[PDB]
């Protein structure tokens, strides 16, 4: 039981840590999608005013 | 560890933004310094 | 603790040169916007 509860706590900690990592990485994906969007519209506008 | 991760992400943000500024404004030097002198 | 202090100091300086650069380059914007307009 000592061994098993040790593993229980350890995997619980690592799961929480990678949960935080997924949260921040998903937030970063959202940020990059917004940024790429902004590039899209502004690039369209510039390339068209240049035409 | 969370604090170091947060502050480090901010470090990359500053680095990228500062690079963009340096680039645009070295270009500004080049272009309009040629158009002036 | 040591590493977070060091990284904090790097934030400090990078912010400072960011400020100086953005300033001299706002000055570049002003002067060269005049000198073409």
């Amino acid at each position: 039981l000592a061994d098993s509860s040790a593993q229980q706590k350890a995997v619980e900690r690592r799961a929480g840590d990678l949960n935080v990592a997924l949260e921040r990485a998903l937030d970063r994906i959202r940020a990059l999608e917004e940024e790429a969007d902004g590039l899209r519209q502004r690039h369209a506008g510039v390339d068209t005013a240049r035409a | 560890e969370a604090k170091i991760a947060e502050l480090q992400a901010t470090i990359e943000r500053l680095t990228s933004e500062a690079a963009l500024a340096e680039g645009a404004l070295e270009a500004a030097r080049r272009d309009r310094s040629r158009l002036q002198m | 603790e040591a590493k977070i202090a060091e990284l904090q100091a790097t934030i400090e300086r990078l912010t400072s040169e960011a400020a100086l650069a953005e300033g001299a380059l706002e000055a570049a914007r002003r002067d060269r916007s005049r000198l073409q307009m």
Partner: nanobody
Amino acid sequence: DSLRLSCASSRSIDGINIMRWYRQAPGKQRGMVAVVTGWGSTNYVDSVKGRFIISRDSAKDTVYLQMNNLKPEDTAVYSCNAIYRGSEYWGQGTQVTVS
């Protein structure tokens, strides 16, 4: 000669390392005015050294961009920035002028 400007974040109170306001003058592009680190030090733009005080307030998460001894030509729409978790978040901009 003096006026006050502070923007409050919606969440993550005290959850932002670098905060900085930018000046947005008409027509011409946008540029920073003053900075606050996550902990108190404050570099500024040479154009406004000593002319502004920038200081946090965790009470309302309102960094205090203080306008003092304003030279009235310096008017501009003012938007405040937040760099949180590596992502950059922009304010709505604010214009002020006197004299």
